[PDB]
Amino acid sequence: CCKCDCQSGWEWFGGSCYLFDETERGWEDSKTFCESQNAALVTVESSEEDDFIRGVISAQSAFHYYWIGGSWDAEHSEYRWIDGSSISFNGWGPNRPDADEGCMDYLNYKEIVWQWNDHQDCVNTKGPSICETDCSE
């Protein structure tokens, strides 16, 4: 994405446009929604990107978690980004992931300060989400 290419309401960082969408949806419905926007739930490859995201979500206080594009990959038996890639950057909150078979969020609660948490209901727990696009073809 060009720096001034983003849709109204989206923000640019690091060659991508992001939507911090405040409509509350289950994780799977958030994944679907980002797809509908020619995007995908955000994947966090670098500490630089992590900082950017934290900068936006920490500046509000209506929401305490946002869905992101990571989840349990059964074949690999670990958490992976939804493009299938390994989670190279460790943005997990302390003693997270707590359990297998979940989906990921940024969470702000107690010891987890806008860091990743694993939630085991990927369908019926409704929260805001973060979509990322790189504007390719």
Binding site: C1, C2, C4, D5, G14, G15, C135
Partner: protein, 138 residues
């Protein structure tokens, strides 16, 4: 993101930026300082559309075959990136480039480098024109 009316006279508007294709004769360091003197920066190229816009302008003249841009080697970064410290997003190196000479970048027009990026060792004494950019960013 600049509007057209943000652009000083003699600057060209494209994609939320204003650009100066300056034909003065400076080394890379001198060109960096020059763009700073205009409350601008040597151009940083974040996407293929911006790269295409620049190529359109450079291929529209034939007097010059290279222009300094806002990237150089940084030893602490231990890489080539933009002078603001941002890593490349769009990759615009010409075929066969970079040479990895810990140098400074231009757009070059020579043989298989068809208005694409090159790295040049001499960041002080090779005199050329340059491209400045005002992007009205944060």
């Amino acid at each position: 993101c600049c509007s057209e009316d943000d652009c000083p006279s003699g600057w060209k508007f494209f994609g939320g930026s204003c650009y100066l294709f300056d034909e003065g004769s400076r080394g890379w360091e001198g060109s960096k300082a020059f763009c700073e003197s205009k409350d601008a920066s040597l151009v940083t190229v974040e996407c293929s559309k911006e790269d295409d816009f620049i190529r359109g302008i450079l291929s529209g003249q034939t007097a010059k075959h290279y222009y300094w841009i806002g990237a150089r080697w940084n030893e602490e970064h231990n890489d080539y990136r933009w002078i603001d410290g941002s890593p490349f997003t769009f990759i615009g190196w010409g075929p066969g480039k970079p040479d990895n000479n810990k140098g400074c970048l231009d757009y070059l027009n020579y043989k298989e480098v068809v208005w694409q990026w090159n790295d040049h060792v001499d960041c002080e004494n090779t005199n050329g024109p340059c491209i400045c950019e005002i992007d009205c960013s944060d």
